[PDB]
Structure formats: structure tokens, C-alpha cells
Subunit: 189 residues, 6 copies
Amino acid sequence: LQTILGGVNKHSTSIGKIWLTVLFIFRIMILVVAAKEVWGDEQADFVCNTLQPGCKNVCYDHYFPISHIRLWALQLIFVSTPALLVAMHVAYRRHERIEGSLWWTYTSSIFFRVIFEAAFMYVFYVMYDGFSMQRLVKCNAWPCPNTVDCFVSRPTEKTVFTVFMIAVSGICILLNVTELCYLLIRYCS
Amino acid sequence: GTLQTILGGVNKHSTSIGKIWLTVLFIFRIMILVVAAKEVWGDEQADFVCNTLQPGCKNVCYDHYFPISHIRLWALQLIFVSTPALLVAMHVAYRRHEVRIEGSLWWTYTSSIFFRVIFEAAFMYVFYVMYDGFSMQRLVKCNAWPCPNTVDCFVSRPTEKTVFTVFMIAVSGICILLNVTELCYLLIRYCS
Amino acid sequence: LQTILGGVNKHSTSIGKIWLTVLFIFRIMILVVAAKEVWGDEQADFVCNTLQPGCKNVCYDHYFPISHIRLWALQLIFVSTPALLVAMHVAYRRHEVRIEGSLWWTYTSSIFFRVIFEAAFMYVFYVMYDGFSMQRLVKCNAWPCPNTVDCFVSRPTEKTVFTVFMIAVSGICILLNVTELCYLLIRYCSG
Amino acid sequence: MDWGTLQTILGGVNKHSTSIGKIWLTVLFIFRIMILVVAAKEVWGDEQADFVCNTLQPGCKNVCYDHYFPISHIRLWALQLIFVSTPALLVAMHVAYRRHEKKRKFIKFKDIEEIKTQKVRIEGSLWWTYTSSIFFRVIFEAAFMYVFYVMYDGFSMQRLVKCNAWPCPNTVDCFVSRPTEKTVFTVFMIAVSGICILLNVTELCYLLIRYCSGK
Amino acid sequence: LQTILGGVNKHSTSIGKIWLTVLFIFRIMILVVAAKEVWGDEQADFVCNTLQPGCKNVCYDHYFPISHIRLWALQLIFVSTPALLVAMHVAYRRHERIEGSLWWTYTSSIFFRVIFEAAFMYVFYVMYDGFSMQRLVKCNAWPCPNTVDCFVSRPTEKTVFTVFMIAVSGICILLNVTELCYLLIRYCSGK
Amino acid sequence: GTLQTILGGVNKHSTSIGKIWLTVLFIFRIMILVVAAKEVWGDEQADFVCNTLQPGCKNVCYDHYFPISHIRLWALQLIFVSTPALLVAMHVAYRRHVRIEGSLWWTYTSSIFFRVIFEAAFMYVFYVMYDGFSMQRLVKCNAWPCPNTVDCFVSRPTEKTVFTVFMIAVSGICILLNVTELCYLLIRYCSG
């Protein structure tokens, strides 16, 4: 793990070092050592006030199409991918300051990260209707008769970690946007 | 430690496109399977619910509709796909006792690209036929013995499994196209 | 793990590299990555149509005296033992990859032992489970189950798929091992 | 996590620390981290599984546990450990950055390795970073200690909690799992955290007298 | 792992080699691979003859305020720090065997280990009124009506490991005391 | 990584027979216990079923017939047997601060003698505690609070019997190997 961190750390600007520690120490660690065990019993402790067989399965699926931790894991892979591609492409030119052909690749990598970070944040807002989890969800999908009452497991703890992930992700957007200013202004002036 | 050494050996001895193919295989096919997808399928049979009182009906209905799990099918595909790439390295080291593609390496490299396309296409075809599409259903109607008449059974997390199924299929389709272009590049050199 | 594989990989013949690939990539990885957790709920999801306490325990034990994954684990350890011990004996005699002198006897015996181990376990798999296909329903009449009790196996189809793959892959290793026997006996007779 | 890499990260921050900073590092790893990993995490394993409420109301247990445990103790300790160790990580790589360039400047050796292995001195740009790193560590430790007190009205866990949130009818009696063991580990974590605060404050005294009394 | 033990192994006296063997190969090894799985179902398999909700929770907590493995883990951590405490002071002098300050720290570290070992042994005896686990515990704490009967899981196996840990810990006390006598003979008795 | 280093150190300092004994311990005693036998005993008490309605009867009954688990007894035996082998290396390193001679002759002979006792003692404990090497499907139980005699059923008795026989047989091989080394040392000493 240290070898992977060392390679990315060597090739970055002043802002890039700050973006790396925010990515590794915060987004990855709290997901690994704190957040993942919070979502362990998401469906096991999902309780619905009904006697209809199969009602619990369809109500949980309706309100949680993808788990929060699974969405964060997918987002982390997508955001970290352009940084790894730069290292692979940089090594390609080495065996065969940012300027020249590397300037366009580095600028495009920052642009991709901003788009990916904003797209996943938009998905989080639309899918779950805000960043606060409710204690009670009212579900009326078949085969549940009429409308049934279902209760979420650890809604408050999940809200706390959701706010933490969104806030730190927003900081990463500002850091990437700031780095986009030190490149556009310098080149165009 | 061990993971870095294995990746470094394959990465160093690779062509231009082959390095792009490698990052798709590891960062997307393997990481999604390991850190996200595997826990989604953890309660595939535990949370499989059938509306019946017949003993043993749940066991046969799950077996009928899931002859093999999606994650186990993906695990088999990844091992089969990665095998020809590793076979090239071991044979190359054998020839050392005895990356430009010239000499006897041309036949082995071309065959390895050809074999990878077949394995990806075969597993993609198996996924479509066995699960009649890439979308999971909330309800499955099962009438196998000893279930009386037709019973209603409900799948666990059908929506999440559909999302990861689409991601795996779409990314595997990209790898098919990447291998085709690499085969086309080799064909251009020899045809001219 | 990498060093252990690297040491055996360097000290092997041409076919031995191929046989190493089949044992590690297919037999070991698939047993660890995929097969092991397929058998995770073998007894937890074993359902019997009965109300007799203890009937489920003796019926599962009767039809599964030893798990398939446990049987495969013993095969892998037993099959890989002659390969590792032949390296220690070679290293011992060398300090005190063709064959020469006493190495011919140690290498030939190791190949012969692996074939015997391979065939014995495959025979056990066939005899103990009367075929390579797992049935959905097993009829059990052992005490204390009254008369005959219907019991249902968990994931019979997936277990059949992995059983077929393990048998076929291990069968390939037998064909590769006997090829080395022909590649060595023909040289001894010619000389 | 790999034990070999555990040596690398622990070893790197060990060299690039002051005399007291090594004492703080030992307490942070042997006590705060090891207890949380090998002892404390298993205690909270069945926090909700063994949470028992005397009621027949569906969903009453879920809301009552969430009301009285908005965030678990182990999750709070994990967040605090990350927040506290981060400033030490940044200040450690800064020392290596200055040590590397000084050796590089000489080449671009034997004496520079002697003084760097002798002791870690704080001067120049390192004074601002090291002082701020200590300042943030004290603030982070006090903030989490304050959160622990306010959220759980003390460091003692009760056997019985009375819950009257919807949909529970009237007031429902609920019982906590392993309250005594959780109290013991809560006290241990709080006490060691107070020790870490004292070490950080004591180090700040060394730096202040070096500058304020130096003038 | 190896380097961590290697450093301590090369920085200890003659008896210190034996003391390190007892600490790692016995205290840590038994706890990690043998003892931790015995206590896994301590509360899951705790059975109480009652219909009172919440009676099982309070009765288990009353009779097991802290688990044995948790107490042993704390004892192992506390006992191992004085050895590292003298290691840091030794390294402090290196940046500038018994000599001067070293004699006043190595002896102090030994004295601390004896107190820590005896304190945890005393705690084990008082908290659990002996080193033998009982099959039945009688509990009358609220809300349990009158006195209820509760049954411990694997009391005999837990007794066996408790005796193993207590006896091995007692040996460490004797070794530390014996080594302390060696130092006092050289310094104080040599005057 | 660390396992290779420890094995390499012990392998580099051993006799010809001692290297065979190391192979039998690592390949068979440790590996089979870790990757095969350990999870066989996983549901030893969860799947222990007793034909009774008495609360607490199952708890006291399992404790009576299984005072210590087989894997726990095997784990203790492995630690005790391997300790003299590692103690030789520790004492040798201190003295330095493969031929057997000098004062090291006494240490090597004592370590082999201690190992023979340790395997024999644990083998005797296994036989006496479980009145044989074969596990029974049914155990009869009259301990309090079980009323009269109750019927209880063991989980996976046949698989446990298979592994019990294998561990005992391999332990007997190690006993014979150690006794052989004792013969090759007394002959080289008493006869010479």
C-alpha cells in the first residue's frame, strides 16, 4: 500500500498533496474502519409492520436501490481512477512542473474528477431525497396490502456519516476547482 | 506487498493498449467484485422468501432460478480471462533459458488475445441465456417438486444486483472491444 | 506466497510449469475464491420434512461423511507434498532443470506418487457420492428418524458445477503427469 | 492491515518526532489503537442484536436504540483517532522533507546524518507547523471528550433506559447489552485521552519557553 | 513481526530470553488461536430459566462485568509496556547490561511488571471468586423475579484455559522476582 | 511473508531427519488444522441437539461430553511440541553472543526427549477423555438439570472421526521419527 501511495505522492502539485490526504485518510478510512460496520445490518434489522410474506423484501428494495456504502465505494473508485491513469501514462512517456503533452492530460484528469464528484453527489440527493435518513418509511408496493409501516436500522448514525461524506466530498470539489484556476490563469496569462 | 509484485510484472511486459486493458481488469472488474459486489450477494439464500408452508420448497426454488451465483460466475470469468495473460509470461521466461511482438512471440500473443475474446463472449452469452436478461425480478414463480402448484418467491436486493450486473456486463464489453483493436493492430502489420 | 511459487517454478521441467499453472490458478484459487463459500451453509440450510429431534443431524452426517471442499483440501495438500519434498531432498543432496544420478529416482517417484494420490481421491469422490451429480432430495431412514424421511440439499446445482470442474481439472493433471512418465521411460529404454 | 506496513508507518513517524513525541506515539498506538482493535470492538459487537425491550410493538426497538445511541462509542473513538493522528502524520513528513533537502543540498553527508539521527530540532518553518499540529490535536481531543459527555450524560452506561418515542406506546423499558464492560472501557479511553492532552500541553510548554523566554 | 521480536530478543538479559518465550509463545499464542474462540458465544449461549424480558441481560452483566479474554488482553498490554518503556530510555541514551540510569530503569521496569502481574491476578480472583467456572449461577437482580437459574456456556473449557493463564502468569512472577534478586546482589549486596 | 522467514530459519538449522519432521508438522499438523479441521468444529455447540424441554440441559450436557474441543486440544499440542524446537534456536543465538557436539548435544537430546513426552501425553489425554478415537452420533445424559436421561446428538460425527484418526496417525509418525533420532544419537555416543 505504501508503494502505491508513494508513486502518486511523488507526482503532484502543492494542492495535489492536500487532495491526496483528504482522499486517503478521510474518504477511505472512515468508510473502511467506521462506516462499513454501520451498514452491516441494514436489511437484517429492517422491520415492517405486516404479516404479508415478501412485503419486507420489496419495501427495502424500493427505498434502498443501492446501499450508501456501495455508492461511496463506487464513487471512490471512479474519482481515484484518473489519478492512476496519469501515473500509467506518465511512465509510458518516461520509458519511451506540468507542461507539454502532460499539461492536457493533467488538466483533463482534474476536469473528470470534478464531473464524477458532482455526478455522484447529485445521485445521492435525488435517490434518497436529501441527506437525512428517516426512522419510518411508508411503502405500498406489491404484494404489501395498502400501505405498510417499515422502520430503518440506525437512521441517526447513518445520517451522521452521510453528512461527513458529503461535506468532505464538497471540499474535494473546491480543491480541484482551485487547482483548475492555477492552470487556466497561468496558461492564459 | 504481494499484490504490487504480481501487478508490476504484468504491467511492465505489456503493449500500449494492453496497459489500458490491464487497468480495466483490476480497478473495475476485480475491485467492484471484491469491495462492493460480494457483500451484496451475501444474503442471496438467507433472505430468499417463499410464500408457502411446504418443507423443502424454498431450497428447490432457489436452486432452480439460481443454478450458479452471479458473483461466482464473475469469479470464474476473471480467472479464465486472466489465465492467457499469465501463461504468456511463464512461457516467455521459459524461452529465456532456451514490448515488441516479433518471432515466436507473435503466435502466442495473438492466440492469447484470441482466447480472451472467446472467454469473454462465452461468459457474456452464459449470463444472458441463464438469467434470461440482465435485469433481476422481484418475484419468481416456481412450480418444481415438492412445491404445491405454483408458489411465489421473492428475491433479495434485486435492484442492487441489477445495477452491478449492468456495470460488470458493460465493462466486460469494453474489454472485448479493446482486445479487438489490439488484434486489428497486429493484423495491419502482417497484412501490409 | 510469491517466493514459494517462484522457488518451485524455477526448479521444474517444461511440463512442470504447465502443471504448476493448473494446480494453482484453477484448483487452489477457485477452491478459495468461489468453492469454499458455496459450501458455507451445507448443514445450516439442510431441511428435513420431519418433527423428530436429532433426525436432521444423523441424516446429513450419513449422506455427507466429509464435505467436498474438505476432500479437495486434502487432495491439494497430498498432491503438492511430493513436489515440495523432492525440492528439499534435491537441495539436501546437492549441497552435501534436468535429471541426473539420484535425482532421476526422486523425480520419477514423486510423479508416480502424485498419480496414485490423484486417482485414489477421485475414486473416493465417485464411490462415496455415487457419482458427480448432487441430488436435490435424499431419502434417509437412519435412527432416530421414523420410517423414511425426505431431506433437501442446499445449492445442489452449483455444487454439481464445481464438482464437475474440479474432477475435470484434476483429470487433466493425471494426463499431464503420465506424459512425463512416457517422456522419461522412453529415454531410459533408448539409452 | 499488513504488519510489515504497520512497521513502515510507525517507524517513519518514530524517527521524525521529538523526545516527548515518541512517548505520545507509544500511548496513542499501544493504548488507544490496540485496545480499540483487539478488546473494545468485540464488546460492542451485539449492541443492537442483544438490545431487548419489553414490548410487542413492531419497530419500537429500532427507534429506541437509535434514540439512546445516535452513534456508537467505538465509531466515535475511531473518528477521534483518525482526527488526532492526522496532524502528526503531516508534521512527520514535513520533517522528512526538510531532512531530505538538506542532505540533497549538500550533495548538490556524514555530518548531516549525524545531527539528524541525534535529535529532532524545531526551528524555522517547522516551528509554525509543529506548534499548529499540537494545537489542533488538543482541540480535537477536547471536542470529542465534550461530545462524549454531552451525548451520553456521563461515562457510566445504564442497565435500563426508558423510551417513549413513537411508535412505542406510553413508556417502554429497554435493557442494554454489557453495560458494565462498556463503562469500564469508556473510562479507560477517557482517562488515556486526558493523558494525551497533558503530554501535548507539556510539549507546548517546551516550545513556548524556547521562544518567549528566549527573546 | 520477526523484527519486532528480534529487537527485544537482542536487548534482553539471559533470563529475559526465557521471559520473552513465556510471554509470546504461551500468553499471546493461547489467547489468539485457542482462547478467543472459546469465549465467542459467552452471551449468545447464556441460558436463563425465566420468562422475564431483560432478565438475561442484567444477570449476565452482573456475573461477567468484563470477559476473561478482555481482562487477559489488558494484562498482556500492560505487562509488555515496561519492557518497551526501558527500550525508549535506552535509545534516548544512544542518541547522546546495567550502568547509571539504566540500572535505575531496568530494575524499575521489572518492579512494575511484578505489580501489574499480581494486580491482575488479584483482580481475577476477587471478581470471579476463584479460578473455576460454575455451570449454574443464581441471579436475583431486577427485573428478575425472586431468584432465577442461569447456565454458563462451556464452563469446563474456560476453567482449563483460566488455569493455564494463571499458572503461566505465576511463572512469570517467579522469573521476574528471581532476576530482580540477581540485580540486587550485584549492586546493593556488593557494597 | 513472515511465515517463510520463520520456516527458513528453522530449516537452515536442522538435521537430515529433523527436516522430515518439520515437513510433517507444517504440511499436515498445522495446514490441515487451519484450513480444513478448524471450520469442521465451527458449529459444534450450535448444532448440538438434545431431545428435551428442560432449560439449561443442553448447556450442561455439551460441557460434560466435550470438556475441551478437539481443535483446542490439538492447538495446545502444536504449541507445546513446537516450543522446544524454537527454544533451541533462541538458546543457540544467546550462546553465539548441522553437527551435534559440545554442550549443544545435551540441549538437542533434551529437546527431542521433551517432544516425545509431549506427543505421548497429549495422545494419552485424547484417548482417555473421549474413550476412543471414534465420535458417537448419540450421547446419553443424566447430569443436572436434565431429567432422568436425555438423548443428545452430535454434529458431524463422521467428519470429526476422519480428522481425529488423521491427526492421531500423523502424531504417531512424529513419535517414531523422534525415537529414531534418539537411536541415531545414542548409537553415535554409547557405542562410539
